[PDB]
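Record YTH domain-containing family protein 3, 191 aa.
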Amino acid sequence: VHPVLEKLKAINNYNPKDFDWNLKNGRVFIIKSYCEDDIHRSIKYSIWCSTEHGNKRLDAAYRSLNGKGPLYLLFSVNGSGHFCGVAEMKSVVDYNAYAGVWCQDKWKGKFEVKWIFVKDVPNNQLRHIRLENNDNKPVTNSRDTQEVPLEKAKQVLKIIATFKHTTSIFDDFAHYEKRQEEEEAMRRERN
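=>
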């Protein structure tokens, strides 16, 4: 286990056993990430960034929720065929600061997150749940920042929370540490 990840696991409480999936209120959105690298950076730095369109949608929902319930984010890397975890949105969107940690280097802005679940859940465990707000297409064919209606979100979160996973993005944390070192070395060589 890479020492950087060991410390993150020590300071956090990933994959809790008492998560309340029977949401009484709050709101739930799908996050469709470009790349595994972004998940690694988000876990390390507890920030996320979507496109300009996606950031505005998440900011508006977080602000309208007014702290009365949680806003959860269900993450899936594009092309992967699975979800890779769940985080809670923990701040308003900052539209002006570049985070400098995404595969899409051009993205401006960020918001704070708290990672709760970090676990791979195959799409075949969720594809039967359809979203009445996306003309009843499966939740697994959603685009980035698609909202999951509350009752469907309870079903999805129950499956994610209880799934006996075998793999997660933590498995090759060492690879992404090395990629970050190289990404940073490349920027230093430019300067």
